[PDB]
């Protein structure tokens, strides 16, 4: 076990979801982001908020992306209220291998509907 | 008993330098410092100076400030040597595990983080 190949700037399944080429349960859309239920949910409610812009990893985000990344969080909290997560929730961004990043397209996880535990992985 | 949402927190003491903390970064909008109950070899918080009690009550105009928390987070992670990655967390309410009602972004790294994230 050794060989690896990666294309961080390349297309991902989340690109395909944004382009509507493959289905997803869409919760919210606007001109700059998409919110949809996770296909491998880890809580009774688990959705993602992703930018339309392909920022591959938060580690390579630019200063001028601050509004957009904040917009993910605002959209995430609004969607959580509309889905009834009034007892609370956890927001998560994963970076790289130690962070458990599954897809090279920045994504904010929102999890709720159960007690979330500590440490957060 | 019960610090209620809207009440001051320990973070006010850390901002005013009334208790010791290992401060990583400070600007006019936010402060980053190491967590005193770390859950990974690197574990730090990024907090706004504006008192936002809970992410559920952030206003629309707080967008750029919340974004700024993530940008400072990622800068600080790079400066602390987290070249293999890290995990960012914001908790809301009881199910989120929050009791300290001031918005705070966790950054954890220096070990493999697992799934699910709690």
Cα separation, B38 vs A119, in Å, equals 9
Technique that determined the structure: X-ray
Residue B105: strand pairing partners: B46
- Give the CA dihedral A13, A19, A25, A26, nearest 10 degrees: 130
Q: What is the resolution of this structure in A?
A: 1.4
Where are the alpha helices (H) located in chain B, listed in sequence order?
10-15, 63-79, 93-96
A-chain CB neighbours of B29 within 8 Å are: none
**Residue found under tokens 């070249």:** B83
Structure-block tokens of residue B37 = 């109950």
In terms of Cα–Cα distance, which of A23, A65, A67, A25 is closest to A48? A25
Q: Binding site for AMP: what residues of A are annotated?
A: 38-39, 94, 100-102, 107-109
CA B67 distance to own-chain centroid: 13
- The CA-based angle B31-B2-A87, given to 5 degrees, is 80
Q: Assess contact for B47 and B11: CB atoms under 8 A.
A: yes
Residues 6+ apart with CB under 8 A from A48: A14, A35, A36, A37, A38, A107, A108, A109, A110
- Exposed, middle or buried: residue A71 (CB in 10 Å: 0-12, 13-18, 19+)? buried
Strand (E) or helix (H) holding A73 = helix A66-82
The CATH architecture one would assign to domain A1-121 is: 2-Layer Sandwich (3.30)
Residue B66 to residue A69, Cβ atoms within 8 A:
yes
Q: Which residues of A touch B78 (CB under 8 A)?
A: 59
Instruction: Indicate the domain borders of chain A.
Output: 1-121
In this complex, which of A88, A97, A114 lies closest to B93 when CB atoms are compared? A88
Q: What kind of architecture, by CATH, is found in domain B1-118?
A: 2-Layer Sandwich (3.30)
Across the interface, do A112 and B96 touch by the CB < 8 Å criterion? Answer: yes
* Structure token pair of residue B74: 């990622």
Q: Are strands B42-48 and B30-34 parallel, antiparallel or unpaired?
A: antiparallel
User: Is B112's CB within 8 Å of A98's CB?
Assistant: yes
């Amino acid at each position: 076990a050794k060989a690896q190949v990666a294309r961080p700037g390349g297309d991902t399944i989340f690109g395909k979801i944004i382009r509507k080429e493959i289905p997803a349960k869409i919760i919210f859309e606007d001109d700059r982001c998409l919110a949809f239920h996770d296909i491998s949910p880890q809580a009774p409610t688990h959705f993602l908020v992703i930018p339309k812009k392909h920022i591959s990893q938060i580690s390579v985000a630019e200063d001028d992306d601050e509004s957009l990344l904040g917009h993910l969080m605002i959209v995430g909290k609004k969607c959580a209220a509309d889905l009834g997560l009034n007892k609370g929730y956890r927001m998560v961004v994963n970076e790289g291998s130690d962070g458990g990043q599954s897809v090279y397209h920045v994504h904010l996880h929102v999890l709720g509907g159960r007690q979330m535990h500590w440490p957060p992985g």
